[PDB]
């Protein structure tokens, strides 16, 4: 029904959550900056955001600017959690001291409903911040949108 907001992290993380890190997320600037603790291997750290609007094979556009104090290249994408499952995003979120904006229109070949139920965790976003940067680093995204067909 409702997406996350065309251009998030512009004052608050909204719902984006990050596990395997220190305290909650930190923004206060206009970019969701999660603190990745060194040695973030093993179990692996990451960030998930439940609340997406995808259906069957529809068109979409992911736009986010991630930047890690270090040159870390983790994994980022999307999928469904709660049947019928199905991932449509498969890329590598590169990061570094410089800003790493991202812009690409992919055809969500799945369906991310919005029903917060026990056996129905709906679909969300998966950020694998584990098994990538050895030393300590972090991720700073900003303005993450994803809608089907939009002005241009």
Swiss-Prot record:
Give every CBM-cenC domain span.
32-141
Segments passing through the bilayer: none
What domain of life does the native source organism fall in? Bacteria
Any idea what job this protein has? The biological conversion of cellulose to glucose generally requires three types of hydrolytic enzymes: (1) Endoglucanases which cut internal beta-1,4-glucosidic bonds; (2) Exocellobiohydrolases that cut the disaccharide cellobiose from the non-reducing end of the cellulose polymer chain; (3) Beta-1,4-glucosidases which hydrolyze the cellobiose and other short cello-oligosaccharides to glucose.
Q: Which family does it belong to?
A: Belongs to the glycosyl hydrolase 9 (cellulase E) family.
- State the name under which the record lists this protein: Endoglucanase C
Q: Which organism is it from?
A: Cellulomonas fimi (strain ATCC 484 / DSM 20113 / JCM 1341 / CCUG 24087 / LMG 16345 / NBRC 15513 / NCIMB 8980 / NCTC 7547 / NRS-133)
Please give the range of the full-length protein represented by this chain. Answer: 33 to 184 of 1101
């Amino acid at each position: 029904a409702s997406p996350i907001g065309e251009g998030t992290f512009d004052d608050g993380p909204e719902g984006w959550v990050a596990y395997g890190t220190d305290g909650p997320l930190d923004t206060s600037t206009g970019a969701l900056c999660v603190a990745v603790p060194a040695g973030s291997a093993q179990y692996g750290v990451g960030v998930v955001l439940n609340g997406v609007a995808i259906e069957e094979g529809t068109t979409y556009t992911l736009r986010y600017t991630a930047t890690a104090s270090t040159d870390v290249t983790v994994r980022a994408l999307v999928g469904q959690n709660g049947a019928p499952y199905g991932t449509v995003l498969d890329t590598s979120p590169a990061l570094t001291s410089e800003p790493r904006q991202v812009t690409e229109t992919f055809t969500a070949s799945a369906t991310y409903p919005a029903t917060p139920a026990a056996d129905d965790p709906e679909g969300q976003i998966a950020f694998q911040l584990g098994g990538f940067s050895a030393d300590a680093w972090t991720l700073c995204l900003d303005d993450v949108a994803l809608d089907s067909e939009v002005e241009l």
